[PDB]
Short mmCIF file of C-alpha atoms and ligand atoms in Angstrom, two decimals:
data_model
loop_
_atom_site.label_atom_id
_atom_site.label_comp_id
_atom_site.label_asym_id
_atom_site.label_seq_id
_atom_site.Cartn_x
_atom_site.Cartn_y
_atom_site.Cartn_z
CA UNK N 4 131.42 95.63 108.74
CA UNK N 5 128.73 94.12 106.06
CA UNK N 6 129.57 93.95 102.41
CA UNK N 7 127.85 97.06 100.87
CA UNK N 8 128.13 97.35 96.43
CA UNK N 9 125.97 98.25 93.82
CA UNK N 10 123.09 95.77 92.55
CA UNK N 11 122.03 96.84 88.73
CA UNK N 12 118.68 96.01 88.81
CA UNK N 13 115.86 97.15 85.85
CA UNK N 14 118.22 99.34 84.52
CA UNK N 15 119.42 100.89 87.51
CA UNK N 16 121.58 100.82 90.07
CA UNK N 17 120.88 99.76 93.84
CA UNK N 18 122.60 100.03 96.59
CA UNK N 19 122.74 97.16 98.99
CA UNK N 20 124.13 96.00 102.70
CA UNK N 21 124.49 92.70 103.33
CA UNK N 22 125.17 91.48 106.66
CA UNK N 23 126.18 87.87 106.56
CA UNK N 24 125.41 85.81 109.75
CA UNK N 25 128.30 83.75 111.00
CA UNK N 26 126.48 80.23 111.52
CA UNK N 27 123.53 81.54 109.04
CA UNK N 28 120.46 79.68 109.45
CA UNK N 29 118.53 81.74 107.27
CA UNK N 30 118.11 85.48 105.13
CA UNK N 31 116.15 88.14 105.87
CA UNK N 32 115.62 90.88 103.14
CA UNK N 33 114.19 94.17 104.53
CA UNK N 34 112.12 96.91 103.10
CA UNK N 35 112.38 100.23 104.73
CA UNK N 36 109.59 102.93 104.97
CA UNK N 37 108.60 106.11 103.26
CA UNK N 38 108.52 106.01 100.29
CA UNK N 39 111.61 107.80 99.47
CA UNK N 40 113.22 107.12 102.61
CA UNK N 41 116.30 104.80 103.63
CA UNK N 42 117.42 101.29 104.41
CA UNK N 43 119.20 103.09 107.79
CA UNK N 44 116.90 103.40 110.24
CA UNK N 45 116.27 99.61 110.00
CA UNK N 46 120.10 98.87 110.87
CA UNK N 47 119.27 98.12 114.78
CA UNK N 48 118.05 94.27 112.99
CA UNK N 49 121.81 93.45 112.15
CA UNK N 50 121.71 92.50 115.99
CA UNK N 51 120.13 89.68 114.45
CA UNK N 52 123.28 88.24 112.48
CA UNK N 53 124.75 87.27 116.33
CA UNK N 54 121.20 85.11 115.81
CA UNK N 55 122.26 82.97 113.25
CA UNK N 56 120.30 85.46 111.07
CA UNK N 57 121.81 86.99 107.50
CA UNK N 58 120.17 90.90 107.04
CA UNK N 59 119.51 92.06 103.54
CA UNK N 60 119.27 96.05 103.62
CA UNK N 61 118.64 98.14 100.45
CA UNK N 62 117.85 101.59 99.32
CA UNK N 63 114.46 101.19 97.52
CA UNK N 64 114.75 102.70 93.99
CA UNK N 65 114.97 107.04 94.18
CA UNK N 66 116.11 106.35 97.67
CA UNK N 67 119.20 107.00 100.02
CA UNK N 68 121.92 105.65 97.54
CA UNK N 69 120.56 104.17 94.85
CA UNK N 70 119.48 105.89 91.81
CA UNK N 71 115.87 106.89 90.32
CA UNK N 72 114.39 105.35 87.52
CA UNK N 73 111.72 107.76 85.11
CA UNK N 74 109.00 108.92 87.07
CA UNK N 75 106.49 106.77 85.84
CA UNK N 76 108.05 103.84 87.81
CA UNK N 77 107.64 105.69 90.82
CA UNK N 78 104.93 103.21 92.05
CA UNK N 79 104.70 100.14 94.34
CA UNK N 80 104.31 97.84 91.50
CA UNK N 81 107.61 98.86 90.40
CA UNK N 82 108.71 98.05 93.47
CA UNK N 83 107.72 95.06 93.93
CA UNK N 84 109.68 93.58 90.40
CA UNK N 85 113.00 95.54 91.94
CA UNK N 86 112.74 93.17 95.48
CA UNK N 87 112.13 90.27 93.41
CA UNK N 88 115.15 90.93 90.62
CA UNK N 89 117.10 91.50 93.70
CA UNK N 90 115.86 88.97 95.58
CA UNK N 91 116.30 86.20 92.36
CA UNK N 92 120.00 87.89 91.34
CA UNK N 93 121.35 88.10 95.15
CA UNK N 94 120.26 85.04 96.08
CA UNK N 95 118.88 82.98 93.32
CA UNK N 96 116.07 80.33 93.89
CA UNK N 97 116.77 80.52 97.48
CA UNK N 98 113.56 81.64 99.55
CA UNK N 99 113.59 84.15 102.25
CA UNK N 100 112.28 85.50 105.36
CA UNK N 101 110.84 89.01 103.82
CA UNK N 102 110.28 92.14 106.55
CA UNK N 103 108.71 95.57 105.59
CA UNK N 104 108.82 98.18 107.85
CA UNK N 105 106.03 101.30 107.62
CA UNK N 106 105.82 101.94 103.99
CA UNK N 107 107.90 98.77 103.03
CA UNK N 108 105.41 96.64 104.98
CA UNK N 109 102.62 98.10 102.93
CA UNK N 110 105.24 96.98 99.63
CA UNK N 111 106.36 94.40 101.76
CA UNK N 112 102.70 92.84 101.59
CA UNK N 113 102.33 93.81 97.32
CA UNK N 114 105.18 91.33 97.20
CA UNK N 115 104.10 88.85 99.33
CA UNK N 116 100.97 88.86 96.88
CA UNK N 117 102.79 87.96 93.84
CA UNK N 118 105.80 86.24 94.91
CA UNK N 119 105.08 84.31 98.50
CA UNK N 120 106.89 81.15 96.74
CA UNK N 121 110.07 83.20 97.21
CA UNK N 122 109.49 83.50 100.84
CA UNK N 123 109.55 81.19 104.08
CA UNK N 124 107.91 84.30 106.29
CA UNK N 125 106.69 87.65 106.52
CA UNK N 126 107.35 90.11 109.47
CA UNK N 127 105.29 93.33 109.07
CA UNK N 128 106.03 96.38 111.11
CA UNK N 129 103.56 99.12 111.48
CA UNK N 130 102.77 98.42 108.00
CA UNK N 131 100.21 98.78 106.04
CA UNK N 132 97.08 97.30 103.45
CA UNK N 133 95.66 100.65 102.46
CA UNK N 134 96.49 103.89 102.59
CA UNK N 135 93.13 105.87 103.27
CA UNK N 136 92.60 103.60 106.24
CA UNK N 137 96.01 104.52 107.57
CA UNK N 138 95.06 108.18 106.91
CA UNK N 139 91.85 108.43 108.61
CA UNK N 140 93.63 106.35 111.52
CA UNK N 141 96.38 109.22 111.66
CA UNK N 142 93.69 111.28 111.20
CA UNK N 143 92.40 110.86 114.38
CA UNK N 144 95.18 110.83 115.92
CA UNK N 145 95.52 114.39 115.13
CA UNK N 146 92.07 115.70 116.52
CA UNK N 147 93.75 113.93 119.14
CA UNK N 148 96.88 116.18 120.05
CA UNK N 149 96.70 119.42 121.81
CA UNK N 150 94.50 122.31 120.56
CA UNK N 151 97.49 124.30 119.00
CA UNK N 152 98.85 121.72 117.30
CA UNK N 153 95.81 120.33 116.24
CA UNK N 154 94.53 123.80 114.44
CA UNK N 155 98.20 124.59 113.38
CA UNK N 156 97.81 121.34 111.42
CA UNK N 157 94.44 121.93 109.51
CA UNK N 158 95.19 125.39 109.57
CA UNK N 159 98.34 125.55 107.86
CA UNK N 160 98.16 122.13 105.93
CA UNK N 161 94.86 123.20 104.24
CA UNK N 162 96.95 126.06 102.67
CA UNK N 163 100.18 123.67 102.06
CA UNK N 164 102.28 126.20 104.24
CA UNK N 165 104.08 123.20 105.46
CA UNK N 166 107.23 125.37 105.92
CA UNK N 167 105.25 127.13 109.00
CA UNK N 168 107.10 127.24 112.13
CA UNK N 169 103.73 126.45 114.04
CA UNK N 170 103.01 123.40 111.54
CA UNK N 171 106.48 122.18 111.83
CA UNK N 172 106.38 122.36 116.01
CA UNK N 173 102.83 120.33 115.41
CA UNK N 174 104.85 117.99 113.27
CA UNK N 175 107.75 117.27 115.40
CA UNK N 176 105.38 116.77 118.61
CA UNK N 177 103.33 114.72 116.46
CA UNK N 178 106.33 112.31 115.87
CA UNK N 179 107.94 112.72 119.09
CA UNK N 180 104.62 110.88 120.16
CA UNK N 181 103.94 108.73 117.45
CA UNK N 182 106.83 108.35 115.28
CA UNK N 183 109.52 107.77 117.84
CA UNK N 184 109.03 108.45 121.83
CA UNK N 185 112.59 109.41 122.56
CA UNK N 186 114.91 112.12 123.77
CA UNK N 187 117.50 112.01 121.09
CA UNK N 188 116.98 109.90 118.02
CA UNK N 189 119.75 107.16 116.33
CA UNK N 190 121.73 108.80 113.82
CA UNK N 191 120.47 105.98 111.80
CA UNK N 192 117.09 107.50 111.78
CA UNK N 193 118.07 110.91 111.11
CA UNK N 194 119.78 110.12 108.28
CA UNK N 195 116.54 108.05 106.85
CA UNK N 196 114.77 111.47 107.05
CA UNK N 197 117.79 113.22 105.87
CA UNK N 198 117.26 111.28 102.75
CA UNK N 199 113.06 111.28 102.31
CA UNK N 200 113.88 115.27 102.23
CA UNK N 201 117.00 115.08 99.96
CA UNK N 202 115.49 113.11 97.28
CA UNK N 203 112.57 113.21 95.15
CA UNK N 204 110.31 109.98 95.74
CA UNK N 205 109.23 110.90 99.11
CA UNK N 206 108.02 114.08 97.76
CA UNK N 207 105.94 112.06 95.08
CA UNK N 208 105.21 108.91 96.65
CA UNK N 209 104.05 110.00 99.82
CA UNK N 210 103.50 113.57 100.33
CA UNK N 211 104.68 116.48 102.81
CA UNK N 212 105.36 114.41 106.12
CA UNK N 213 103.66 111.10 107.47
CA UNK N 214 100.15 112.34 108.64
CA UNK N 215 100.17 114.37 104.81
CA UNK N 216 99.55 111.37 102.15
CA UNK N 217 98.99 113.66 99.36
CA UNK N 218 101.69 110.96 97.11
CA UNK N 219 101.05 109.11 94.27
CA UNK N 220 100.14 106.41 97.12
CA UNK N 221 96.92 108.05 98.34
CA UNK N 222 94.35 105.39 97.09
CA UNK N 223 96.42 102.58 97.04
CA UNK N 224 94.56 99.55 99.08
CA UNK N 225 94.86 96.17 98.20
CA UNK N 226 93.62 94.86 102.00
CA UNK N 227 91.25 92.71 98.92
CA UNK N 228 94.39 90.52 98.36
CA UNK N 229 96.52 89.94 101.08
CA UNK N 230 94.31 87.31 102.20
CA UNK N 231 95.95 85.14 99.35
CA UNK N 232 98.91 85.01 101.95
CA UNK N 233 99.58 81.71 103.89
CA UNK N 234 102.97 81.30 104.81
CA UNK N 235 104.33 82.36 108.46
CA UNK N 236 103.12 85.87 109.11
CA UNK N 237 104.69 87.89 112.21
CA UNK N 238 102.94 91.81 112.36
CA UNK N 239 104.11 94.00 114.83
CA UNK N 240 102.78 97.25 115.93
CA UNK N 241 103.62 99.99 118.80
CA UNK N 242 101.03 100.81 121.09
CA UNK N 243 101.03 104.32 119.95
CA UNK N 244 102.29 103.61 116.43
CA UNK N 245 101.60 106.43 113.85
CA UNK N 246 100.05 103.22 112.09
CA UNK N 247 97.74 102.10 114.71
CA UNK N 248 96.91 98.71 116.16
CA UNK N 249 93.68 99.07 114.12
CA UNK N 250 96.10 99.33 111.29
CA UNK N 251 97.23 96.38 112.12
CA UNK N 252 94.49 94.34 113.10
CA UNK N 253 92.94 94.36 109.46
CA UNK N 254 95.97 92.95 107.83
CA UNK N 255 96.51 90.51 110.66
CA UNK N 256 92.76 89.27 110.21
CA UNK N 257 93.10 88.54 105.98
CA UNK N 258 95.82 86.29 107.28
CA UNK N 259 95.26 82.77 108.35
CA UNK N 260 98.31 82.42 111.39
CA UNK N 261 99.60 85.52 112.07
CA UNK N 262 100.54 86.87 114.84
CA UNK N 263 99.76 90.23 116.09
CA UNK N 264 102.48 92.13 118.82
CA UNK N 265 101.17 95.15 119.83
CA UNK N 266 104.41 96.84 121.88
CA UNK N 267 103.65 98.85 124.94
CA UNK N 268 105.49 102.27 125.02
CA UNK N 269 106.22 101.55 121.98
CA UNK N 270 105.33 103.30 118.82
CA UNK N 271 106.58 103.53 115.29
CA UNK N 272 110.56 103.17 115.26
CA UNK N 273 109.80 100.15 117.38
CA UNK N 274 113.31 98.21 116.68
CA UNK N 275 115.11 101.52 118.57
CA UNK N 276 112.43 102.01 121.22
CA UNK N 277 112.46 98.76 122.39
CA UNK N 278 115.41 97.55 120.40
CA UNK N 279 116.13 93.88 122.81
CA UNK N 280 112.84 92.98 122.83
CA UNK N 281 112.15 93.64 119.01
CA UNK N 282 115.28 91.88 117.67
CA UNK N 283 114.23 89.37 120.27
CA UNK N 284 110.66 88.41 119.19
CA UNK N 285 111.90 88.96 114.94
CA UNK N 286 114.57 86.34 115.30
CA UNK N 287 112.44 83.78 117.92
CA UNK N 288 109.33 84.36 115.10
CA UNK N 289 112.35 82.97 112.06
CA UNK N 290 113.43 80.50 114.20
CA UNK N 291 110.16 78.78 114.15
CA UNK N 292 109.91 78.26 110.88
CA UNK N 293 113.72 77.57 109.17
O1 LIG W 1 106.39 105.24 106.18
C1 LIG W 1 105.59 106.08 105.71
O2 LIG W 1 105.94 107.19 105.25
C2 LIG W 1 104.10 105.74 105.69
C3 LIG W 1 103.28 106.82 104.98
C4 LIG W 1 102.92 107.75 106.10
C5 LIG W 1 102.51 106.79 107.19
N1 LIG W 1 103.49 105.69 107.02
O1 LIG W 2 109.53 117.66 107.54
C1 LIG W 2 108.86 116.61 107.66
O2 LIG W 2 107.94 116.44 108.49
C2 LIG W 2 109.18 115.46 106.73
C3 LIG W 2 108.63 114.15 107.29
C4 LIG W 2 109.69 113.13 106.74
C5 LIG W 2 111.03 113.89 106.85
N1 LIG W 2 110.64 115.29 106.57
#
């Protein structure tokens, strides 16, 4: 049992979990994926509090819990200046150990780029520096799944009939392959999705589903800055991540001493796949630089 409440921050308010760590040696504030999704899926990292390691989750603005600002804000920018406010009224002057998983890696790295001083480390997983990369990346991945699907997916996305039975089994495969490799998923997850399809920034932000980028996202690339980053970087990526290795590799090449983990069996919703071994390397990467 963390202490959940309600953060105002820029004029609205946000929901947030925080899961205090009993002999705390140091914070880490997490950014979940989407956009438009939910802090949820991400819960598997409170493992880390029996670490020595206090987990910040929060709903993003528009998402799970928290409420949605005007539509104009709907951007990463805005984003960005809601982790900070957070970050500088939860915690003060404190720095922390920032993580941004999937879409919040991609913000994850926006903040990093503006306000590293606030931050000891960053742990990116199967995140992101631009968007058309990631699509073309995903992209292949599709000419890359079985016939049906494949056609289903061009066939019935080129004509937005996303509802299509055929396009959703194409979907569901897809994810079942890339997204999470699984029999039955966490209810944690489920309820991440539950929320990208029950609210309105998902729909926006990032489009139909997570090969469909159609969202006010689509060009966004700023793989041009991240190089600015120097403090600890840890990115992580499954070996069959939706957000391939390749992905990856460019972010973890604009910065000087990061590490790249590239989990086998793995793919997306790598903390649940290979939960031990994820909460294992996250905490042993903080650990190393307190
Ligand atoms: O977490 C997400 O939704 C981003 C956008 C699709 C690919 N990954
Ligand atoms: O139906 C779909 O595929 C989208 C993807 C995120 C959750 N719902």
């Amino acid at each position: 049992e963390c202490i959940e409440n309600y953060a105002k921050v820029n004029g609205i308010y946000i929901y947030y979990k925080l899961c205090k760590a009993p002999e705390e040696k140091a914070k880490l504030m997490t950014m979940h994926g989407g956009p438009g999704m939910s802090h949820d899926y991400l819960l598997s990292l409170r493992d880390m509090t029996k670490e020595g390691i206090t987990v910040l989750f929060y709903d993003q603005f528009g998402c799970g819990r928290s409420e949605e600002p005007d539509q104009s804000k709907f951007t990463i920018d805005y984003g960005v200046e809601e982790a900070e406010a957070l970050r500088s009224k939860l915690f003060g002057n404190e720095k922390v150990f920032l993580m941004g998983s999937s879409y919040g890696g991609a913000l994850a790295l926006a903040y990093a780029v503006k306000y590293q001083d606030h931050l000891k480390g960053l742990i990116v997983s199967g995140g992101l520096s631009s968007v058309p990369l990631t699509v073309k990346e995903m992209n292949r991945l599709i000419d890359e799944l079985p016939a049906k699907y494949r056609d289903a997916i061009k066939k019935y996305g080129s004509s937005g009939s996303y509802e299509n039975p055929e396009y959703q089994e194409a979907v569901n495969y897809f994810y079942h392959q890339h997204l999470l490799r699984s029999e039955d998923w966490p209810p944690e997850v489920l309820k991440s999705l539950e929320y990208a399809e029950r609210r309105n920034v998902y729909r926006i932000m990032n489009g139909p589903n997570e090969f469909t980028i159609t969202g006010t996202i689509k060009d966004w690339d700023i793989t041009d800055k991240i190089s600015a980053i120097k403090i600890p970087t840890l990115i992580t990526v499954g070996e069959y991540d939706q957000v391939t290795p390749n992905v990856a590799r460019v972010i973890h090449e604009k910065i000087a001493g990061s590490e790249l983990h590239v989990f086998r069996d793995c793919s997306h919703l790598t903390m649940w796949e290979d939960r031990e071994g994820y909460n294992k390397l996250l905490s042993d990467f903080i650990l190393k630089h307190l």
